[PDB]
Amino acid sequence: RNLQKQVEKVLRKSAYKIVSGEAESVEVTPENLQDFVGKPVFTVERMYDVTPPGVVMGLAWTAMGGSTLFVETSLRRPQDKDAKGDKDGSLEVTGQLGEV
Q: Which residues bind other proteins (CB under 8 A)?
A: 38-41, 43-44, 47-48, 51, 54-55, 72-78, 81-82, 85, 92, 94-96
Q: Which long-range contacts (CB under 8 A, 24 or more apart) does 93-99 make?
A: none
Looking at beta carbons only, is 52 or 65 nearer to other proteins?
Answer: 52
- Check: CB of residue 70 under 8 Å from CB of residue 47: yes
Bridge partner list, 60: 67
Nearest residue (CB) to other proteins, 22 versus 88: 88
Minimum CB–partner distance for residue 77 and other proteins (Å): 6
* Closer residue to other proteins, CB minimum distance, 24 or 39: 39
Beta bridge partners of 1: none
Q: Closest separation between CB of residue 81 and other proteins, Å?
A: 5
In the complex, minimum distance from the CB of residue 84 to other proteins, in angstroms, rounded to a whole number: 12
**CA dist list (Å): 5 to 2, 40, 77:** 5, 15, 50
